[PDB]
Amino acid sequence: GPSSHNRYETVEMVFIATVTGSLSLVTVVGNILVMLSIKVNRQLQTVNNYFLFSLACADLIIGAFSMNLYTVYIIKGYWPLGAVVCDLWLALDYVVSNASVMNLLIISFDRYFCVTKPLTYPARRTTKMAGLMIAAAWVLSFVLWAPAILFWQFVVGKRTVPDNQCFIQFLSNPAVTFGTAIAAFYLPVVIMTVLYIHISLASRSRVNIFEMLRIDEEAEKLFNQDVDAAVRGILRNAKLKPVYDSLDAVRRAALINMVFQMGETGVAGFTNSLRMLQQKRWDEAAVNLAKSRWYNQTPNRAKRVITTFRTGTWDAYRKVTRTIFAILLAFILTWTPYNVMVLVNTFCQSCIPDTVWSIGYWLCYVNSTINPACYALCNATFKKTFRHLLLC
Ligand SMILES: C[N+]1(C)[C@@H]2C[C@@H](OC(=O)C(O)(c3cccs3)c3cccs3)C[C@H]1[C@@H]1O[C@@H]12
Ligand SMILES: CCCCCCCC/C=C/CCCCCCCC(=O)OC[C@H](O)CO
Ligand SMILES: CCCCCCCC/C=C\CCCCCCCC(=O)OC[C@H](O)CO
Ligand SMILES: CCCCCCCC/C=C\CCCCCCCC(=O)O
Ligand SMILES: O=C(O)CN(CCN(CC(=O)O)CC(=O)O)CC(=O)O
């Protein structure tokens, strides 16, 4: 009949339902796989993965409920579920998403403190503190968003949202929406950006050195100064330089340890041992280093340093950053357009049609779908665990 759906409507809605349904299923299955991977693998049960587990929970909630409800809204052309379900859905959406953002913040700060304070922070990095931070993120998200979405109509004394529509009445004013965007999206993005910059600039060739010196001996600033000073002394010394240049990272760090303990002049006295180190003859160098007063005065430390010279490993004493960077990149890329629309809406509401708004809003969801793929691509343990889970 003439009341039936026209061809364009049918094709459009079937396409939308197919694509969005597929993304929903992929999101749900993916995040379930991530959570299960964290649950079953003992090697994947670290604080970072507690955080990642939380994020996976958020992404699961988004993929299961948010996507489908929003697609109901899109396909129907209006809201057919009522004002109550509208409120519940909006609250769920914004609380869970905010919790995701704060989760990313916690992760970023955690990595930052891990690479910048490798002596004091890892000791205070318990699972209790992790759970405290996660709970804090979710609770704060709820306290910050749920009242604004649910109780604002009560404060005003009137719900201005039509029963056939669904939007946050609190965010009616473009200015308020933008300020909210600043507090919720822009500032965390900036902070995480700075943190990522400092993390990427932070060498992990020196992080092991601090632990080494910690073993052989808030005082991290002292180490930060003294290590640099030692390296400077090595580069200043005409005899220590060629040995330092012709040495691997671990063993050159051992040389740095020697300079740290005795000074550039004291280490420069080990002519035979240094020249032996140049030819990478670790055994001979060890035997010649056993003849020194240094080996007798501090026997244990000398044993550790010499053994370190022998094996070239930390036996006498990384992909996560990449994964997290991938997650952050997905977040930024997927959420940026909508918030840019929020920015434009402050002076020009007509420049952004409802279709573009809808595309952006939905685009923010895709992040939850991307994250498990980031786990499976930037990490091999998660991938192997996935493969082990699909057949078990
Ligand atoms: C698709 N979402 C579900 C909704 C719209 C987008 O929202 C965002 O990008 C915003 O920066 C804001 C948009 C408008 C005012 S503040 C955030 C909102 C909440 C936490 S961060 C992303 C998510 C988020 O839950 C909202
Ligand atoms: C509108 C109202 C919205 C309400 C929304 C409610 C969301 C509830 C989700 C809680 C998950 C919290 C994250 C928990 C992450 C840690 C869990 C854990 O303990 O993982 C250990 C893992 O096995 C390693 O050993
Ligand atoms: C990560 C951090 C995310 C933080 C997220 C915060 C969300 C908002 C919560 C409290 C602000 C409440 C401010 C209320 C001030 C008045 C608002 C107003 O007047 O709104 C009018 C409305 O637009 C038409 O009636
Ligand atoms: C994290 C939990 C996600 C949501 C789980 C709960 C699923 C939905 C549960 C029941 C919804 C009840 C509200 C429906 C209101 C109906 C009244 C009306 O039609 O106006
Ligand atoms: O052209 C139309 O409107 C569709 N036709 C074909 C029949 N309808 C089914 C029906 O309403 O009986 C096909 C359709 O669903 O479009 C209705 C009619 O002219 O009687």
HEC sequence for 319-367? HHHHHHHHHHHHHHHHHHHHHHHHHHCCCCCCCCCHHHHHHHHHHHHHH
**Separation of 216 CA from ligand 5 center, angstroms?**
87
Q: Phi and psi for 150 in degrees, rounded to 5?
A: -95, -40
Tally the residues of the chain: 392
Contact by Cβ (8 Å): 31, 371: yes
What one-character-per-residue DSSP string does 39-65 give? HH-GGG-SHHHHHHHHHHHHHHHIIII
Q: How many Å apart are CA 156 and CA 152, to the nearest integer?
A: 6
CA distances from 109 to 58, 106, 204, 323 (A): 19, 5, 17, 15
User: For 120, how many CA atoms within 13 A lie in the half-sphere containing its CB?
Assistant: 9
Chain breaks after residues in the chain, where C lies over 2.5 Å from next N? 217, 317
DSSP state of 6: P
d(CA 124, CA 46): 14
Report yes or no: 192 and 104 within 8 Å, Cβ to Cβ. yes
Assess whether the C-beta atom of 339 lies below 6 angstroms from ligand 1: yes
The data reach a resolution, in angstroms, of 2.6
Residue nearest to atom 24 of ligand 2 (CA): 45
Is residue 90 within 8 Å of residue 168, measured between CB atoms?
yes
Amino acid in the structure at residue 303: K
Helix, strand or coil, per DSSP, at residue 248: coil
Say how many C-beta atoms besides its own lie within 10 A of residue 281's C-beta: 13
Question: Which ligand has its closest atom nearest to the C-alpha of 3?
Answer: 5
Report the alpha-carbon angle 66-48-370, nearest 5: 35
| Amino acid occupying residue 298 | T
C-alpha span between 80 and 71 (Å, rounded): 12
Tokens 């923010």 found at: 364
The tokens 């000791």 sit on which residue? Answer: 123
Question: Tokens 């129907």 identify what position?
Answer: 76
364 alpha carbon – ligand 1 mean position (Å): 8
Q: Is the dihedral of CA 274, 276, 280, 282 positive or negative?
A: negative
Q: Which approach determined this entry? A: X-ray
Separation of alpha carbons 255 and 352, rounded Å? 62
Residues 82 and 163: beta-carbon distance below 8 Å:
yes
Q: Which amino acid is at 295?
A: Y
CA 50 to chain centre: 12
Rounded to whole angstroms, the Cα distance separating 227 from 76 reads 66
Which one-letter DSSP state was computed for residue 247? S
Q: Among candidates 125, 132, 50, 126, which has minimal Cα distance to 320? A: 50
Q: CA 28 to CA 26: how far, in whole Å?
A: 6
Catalytic, 217? Answer: yes
Concatenated DSSP letters of 292-326: SHHHHHSHHHHHHHHHHHHH-SSTT--HHHHHHHH
Ligand nearest to the CA of 34: 2
Q: How far apart are CA 150 and CA 83, in angstroms?
A: 11
Q: Which residues of 177-192 are buried (b: 16+ CB within 10 A; e: fewer)?
A: bbebbeebbeebbeeb
Could you tell me which of 274, 207, 201 has the C-alpha nearest to residue 234? Answer: 274
| CB contact set of 127 (below 8 Å; sequence gap of 6+) | 47, 50
Among 378, 341, 362, residue whose Cα is nearest residue 63: 362
Q: What share of the chain is helix, strand, coil (3-state, %, to 5)?
A: 80, 0, 20
- Spot the catalytic one: 9, 211, 217, 284: 217
Long-range pairs for 114-120 at CB < 8 Å and ≥24 separation?
115/199, 115/202, 115/204, 115/207, 116/198, 116/202, 117/220, 118/207, 118/210, 118/211, 118/220, 119/210, 119/211, 119/214, 119/219, 119/220, 119/223, 120/218, 120/220
User: What residues form the annotated binding site for substrate?
Assistant: 260, 273, 288
The first and second tokens of residue 304, run together, are 């550790």
CA distance 389 to 33: 8
Q: Kindly give the number of the ligand 4 atom that is closest to the alpha carbon of 83.
A: 20
The DSSP annotation for 263-293 comes to HHHHHHT-HHHHHHHHTT-HHHHHHHHTTSH
Residue labelled with tokens 């090595």? 234
Q: Distance (Å, rounded) from C-alpha 107 to C-alpha 50?
A: 10
CA distances from 30 to 65, 166, 323 (A): 15, 29, 15
The CA distance from 69 to 71, in Å, is 5
Q: Across the chain, how many H-helices and E-strands are there?
A: 19, 0
How far does Cα 119 stand from its chain's mean position?
A: 21
Give the end-to-end CA distance of the chain in Å, rounded to a whole number: 51
Asked if 192 contacts 109 with a C-beta cutoff of 8 angstroms, the reply is no
Spatial CA neighbour of 322 closest among 204, 222, 237: 204
Tokens standing for residue 260:
């740290």
Beta carbons within 8 Å of 30's beta carbon, 6+ residues apart: 63, 369, 371, 372, 373
CA distances from 371 to 42, 62, 100, 246 (A): 21, 12, 12, 42
Rounded to the nearest angstrom, the distance between the alpha carbon of 325 and the centre of ligand 1 is 21
Q: Whose CA is nearest to atom 1 of ligand 3?
A: 184
Ligand 2 centroid, distance to 44 Cα (angstroms): 17
Q: Which of 225, 226, 255 is nearest to 241 (CA)?
A: 255
Cβ contact 239:268 at 8 Å: yes
Helices 82-116 and 319-344 pack at an angle, to 10 degrees, of 130
Residue 280 φ/ψ region, left for φ over 0, alpha for ψ in the -120 to 50 degree band, beta for the rest: left
| Structure token digits, residue 243 | 């040995």
Task: Identify the residues whose C-beta falls under 6 Å from ligand 3.
Answer: 98, 101-102, 144-145, 148, 170, 172-173, 176, 180, 183-184
Q: Which of 338, 329, 326 is nearest to 365 (CA)?
A: 338
Q: How far is CA 180 from CA 104, 184, 186, in A?
A: 18, 6, 9
* Burial grade of 37 (CB within 10 A; 0-12, 13-18, 19 or more): buried
